[PDB]
Structure 1
């Protein structure tokens, strides 16, 4: 007989960055992590297990993928096979309703969607905590997409202790919004994974990253507990920039940032001066995310339109709900 599952997971952008791995093989992070989940961007993955298959197949956006991409999905399906009890090979059919490998967190939606589909298919009855544990093995950020609203990846010390949970903001997430500035739509030159790896191993500024990360997290946490937007913005803006500083310290150094990324930051500043409270963060890539309270979405979004082509400004709400079966 043949088992199938289909899930939809939304993406997440980290306010307090995950950048750098303690353990490269289980995906244990060097530091705790805090993100918001977005309902405008998402992955839909269906998985089918068949006695007929002899290796695992990934179909992504309609296309069978390459052979290091294959390799990557193989090692994950292996992890699923050990945990499930069986020997079945799978075929995966996934559509990214979100730009791919481009620094908009297709990793997080991808592997949350998959893990949750695997769960349904193989009838695993996984707790949210174990789900998060599973997605984490595919992609660090994916651990957080099991959940909605604000979520946190607790770094733990091994495979059982490293996972994520949700956080009550008493629905403060409902009054929030995130403007995407889509400067580049295409593949990162360097993948989140390998850039993280090089910065972590070699960066002369990494230690500086680590000495400040936890102080930022508590501050961000106290900000959500009080719903002080200004307080939250200030720390997440600095944290994000500090994350990128670590790349400048790598051997040899590098950056995901382009002139346009800077231009965007400036407009945020002008907005703040013009009395429109907003802050920016950047995943691994040139694109810029702008956190703004729902009230000033239109205004702030307008300010960008004076400078950017409108096929490039994209407002998302923050979703309150976690990953769903479909």
Structure 2
């Protein structure tokens, strides 16, 4: 009977935002990065994924938000599932059922929560009994940023130098996360963006300014960590803001140059500078798109939102607390 036979698992993984950036792979196939990155896991946004391994199934199937996925996005997941099968030692195809609670049409990436939730769901389904480190590794090989979603609060992706040694790790932050929040200003550009994987490879391999990134990444890592250990919000905010801008400065040097940012991104940056002037500490970061994220203290969250509303539509403004706990298995 099917119920005697099937192997299944369900998990929830939250999105994380990199404060010190992942930008450039050392190894493309294996997803080993050129540098460590430090993230914060966000409580409002997540992916819930169920996996069901079944010996009768002839091909993997994938439903996302109740829609059947075909094309290259199925191809992508079936390649990942071959890796999971290889690691688990099982040849069964799977039905994957996923629901994104991440606004992805708003340009917020789901890669991070999607591969972490699928990794944790397989570990459940196949009784892999993986440690957090091995779990993180399994997520990493589908998506770099997902390695870090195994953890709540602050996480560091250790670059390592092999599939075995590249994984994320919890950073001790002594509850610093509970005092913090992030605000997203969602931005609609009308050109299609450089895809992140292609964008970062072009820049890493081709940018005239990439050495600039490399010359300063290790100081930034150490600075952010020491600010985190010391609960120093302005010291954290400053490195992370300059880190993120340097990430973007690198794309200007690529052959040919490209940008993630549009004029509205800069209007958001101008408002956050005004907020600091006005006595409200907050610091901005951008990822592989024009959206702007603002790290704030919870005590000032509403005050930053009110200032943003003088200039931005209510429907462009989304916030989230930082969640302190990690990846959750369901039932």
Same fold, TM-score > 0.5, yes or no: yes
Map 1:173-212 to 2 at 5 A: 173-184=177-188, 189-212=193-216
SS of equivalent residue, structure 2 residue 128? coil
Moved more, 64-73 or 279-288: 64-73
The residue correspondences of 1:1-326 to structure 2 (distance < 5 A) are 1-100=5-104, 103-184=107-188, 189-326=193-330
Offset of residue 68 of structure 1: 1.5
Q: Equivalent residue of 1:214, what SS?
A: helix
Q: How far apart are residue 104 of structure 1 and its match?
A: 2.5
Aligned counterparts of 2:104 and 2:259: Cα–Cα separation in 1: 19
After TM superposition, the score normalised by the length of structure 2 is 0.96
- Per-residue deviation at 1:101? 7.3
- Secondary structure in 2 aligned to 1:138? coil
1:58 Cα offset (Å): 1.7
CA, structure 1 residues 267+154, in 2 after alignment: closer, same or farther (shift >3 Å)?
same
Q: Partners in 2 of 1:174 and 1:71 — Cα distance?
A: 39
Structure 2 distance, partners of 1:101, 1:126, is: 33
Question: In the TM superposition, what is the alpha-carbon distance from 1:55 to its structure 2 partner?
Answer: 1.3
Query: Structure 1: how far apart are the matches of 2:98 and 2:193?
Result: 23
Query: Is the contact made by 1:136 and 1:142 (CA closer than 8 Å) also made in structure 2?
Result: yes
Superposed CA offset, 1:210-267 (max 9, x none)? 1111110000001011111110111000000000111111111111111110000000
1:162-194 Cα offsets, whole Å, 9 max, x none, are 000111211010000101111139996332211
**SS of corresponding position for 1:279:** strand
Deviation, 1:65, is 2.3
Aligned equivalents of 1:162 and 1:170: distance in 2? 25
- Contact 2:107-2:186 at 8 Å conserved across structures: no
Count of residue correspondences: 326
How much has 1:78 moved relative to structure 2?
A: 0.7
Secondary structure of the residue aligned to 1:292 is strand
Give the whole-Å Cα distance in 2 for the aligned partners of 1:197 and 1:188: 18
SS of residue matched to 2:141: helix
DSSP 3-state at the match of 1:178: strand
Query: 2:45 is paired with a residue of what secondary structure?
Result: strand
What RMSD over aligned residues (CA atoms) do the two structures have, in Å? Answer: 1.5
Does the 8 A contact of 1:132 with 1:164 survive in 2? yes
Preserved contact between residue 12 and residue 105 of structure 1 (Cα < 8 Å): no
Q: 92-101 or 45-54, which moves further after superposition?
A: 92-101
Q: Structure 1 unaligned runs (5+)?
A: none
- Partners of 1:49 and 1:122 lie apart in 2 by 8
Q: Is the 8 A contact 1:101 1:186 kept in 2?
A: no
